From a paper:
During bacterial cell division, filaments of tubulin-like FtsZ form the Z-ring, which is the cytoplasmic scaffold for divisome assembly.
Using X-ray crystallography, we demonstrate that [name] [name] crystallizes as an equivalent double filament. The lateral interface in the VmFtsA double filament is almost exclusively formed by contacts between IC domains. Interestingly, the [name] suppressor mutations E124A27 and I143L16 described for E. coli [name] also map to subunit interfaces in the VmFtsA double filament structure. The lipid monolayer assay showed that EcFtsAM96E, R153D was indeed deficient in EcFtsN1-32-dependent double filament formation.
Numbering used by the authors: 8 to 389
The structure:
Amino acid sequence: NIIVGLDIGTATVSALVGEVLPDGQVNIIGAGSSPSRGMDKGGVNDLESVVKSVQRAVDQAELMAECQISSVFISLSGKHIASRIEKGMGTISEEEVSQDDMDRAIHTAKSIKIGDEQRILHVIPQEFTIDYQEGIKNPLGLSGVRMEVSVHLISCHNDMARNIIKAVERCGLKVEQLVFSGLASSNAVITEDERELGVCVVDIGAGTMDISIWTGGALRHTEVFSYAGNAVTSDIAFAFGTPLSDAEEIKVKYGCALSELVSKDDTVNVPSVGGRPSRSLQRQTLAEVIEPRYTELMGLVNQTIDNVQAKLRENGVKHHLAAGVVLTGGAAQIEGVVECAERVFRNQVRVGKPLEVSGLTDYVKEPYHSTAVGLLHYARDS
Ligand SMILES: Nc1ncnc2c1ncn2[C@@H]1O[C@H](COP(=O)(O)OP(=O)(O)OP(=O)(O)O)[C@@H](O)[C@H]1O
Ligand SMILES: [Mg+2]
C-alpha cells in the first residue's frame, strides 16, 4: 500500500512516500522537498504561500513514486502544544477484558474540561492496572474485575491547527492524522533500546524547537518553545548589518556553536546591502554571536528536564536519562552542537539522524528529515 507523510516546516516542506512491508518496515518510494514561504513559529502567516509551497513538494514526490497521493500524515508544532497526564478507570464486564472495556476506560481518562481554544490530537494509553496487577501495557484477554489506565494527552490550539489543515486540503488532499512534530522526530531517531534507560530528544528547527522526554519507553512530557534557528539567524543579521537571506548563508556554511572550536585564521566574507564592498569577518567572531544564543536555547531545555525530573523522582516513576540528550532538526547541524550542549547538559549529548531507511538513502540522511520520516513510522502503525 502507499503511505505518505508531510512535514510542513517553518523553513522547508518535506513530503515522503513509502510502502508497507510484512515485517513492519517502511520502504520509502518517493521524496519531495520545497522551501516554505509564509510560515512563522510553527504556524502559518500566508496561507496562499504554503499551499503552493506544500503542493510544490507533494507534486515532485508523486512523480518520484509513480502514484497519486490522496491521504497524508501531516505534522504540526508550536508553543500551544501542551501535555497532560490523566488517569481513567472502569469495570470489566464478563470477567474478560474486551475492546469495549478499554475504550470506556480510556474515554474516562480523556474526558477533561479543556475548553474550545484547545483540541487534543494525541491520546497515548501507557500503563494499565488490572486488579493489583500494575504495569500492564496491553491488557486484552486478561481476566479481572476492574482496570485502571494512565493516559498521556497532547493538545494544541485549534485555530493554529485549522490553518495547517486548510493548506493541505487546498491542494486536494485529505488529512488522515495530525502528528506532533517532536513525537514523530522522536519515533524516528532513537531506538527502543534508547527508550528504556531514558532520552530527551530536541528538534531545533527554524521556527520552533520540540522537546520530548522518554523515561522507560513511554512519553513523559512534551514542551515546545518558539525560539529556534531563525532567532539566531536574525542575531547574525543584526550584529553585522546584513540581510537575513545573506546572514543565513554565512550560518549554514560558516556557522559554529562554540567560539573556541574555530581558529583565528578562518575569515568569512559577509556582504553589504545597496552595492557596497563586502568586508571580511573573522569566523571566530561570527561564532561568538551564535554561541550565546545556542546556550540559551539549551537552558530552556535543561530547565525543562529539571522541572520534569522533579515531578518523576518525587512520584515513584523512573526519572533518569541514562542515554543523555539527542539533538535533531536542521539547526542541530551547526558545528559544535555536541560540545556546546554537553557544556550545559550534565549528561551526554549526541546528534540524531533518520535511521533504518530502506531505499532513497541519498536524501534521507541529515537530521532535517527526522520529522518527515517519523510520520511514516506513525503511519506504518495502522
Ligand atoms: N548546516 C547548518 N548549520 C546551521 N544551521 C543550519 C544548518 N542547516 C540548516 N540550519 C538551520 O536549520 C533551520 C531549519 O531547519 P529545519 O529543516 O530543521 O526546520 P523546519 O523543520 O522547517 O522547522 P520547524 O522546527 O519550525 O518545524 C534554519 O533556521 C537554518 O538556519
Ligand atoms: Mg521540523
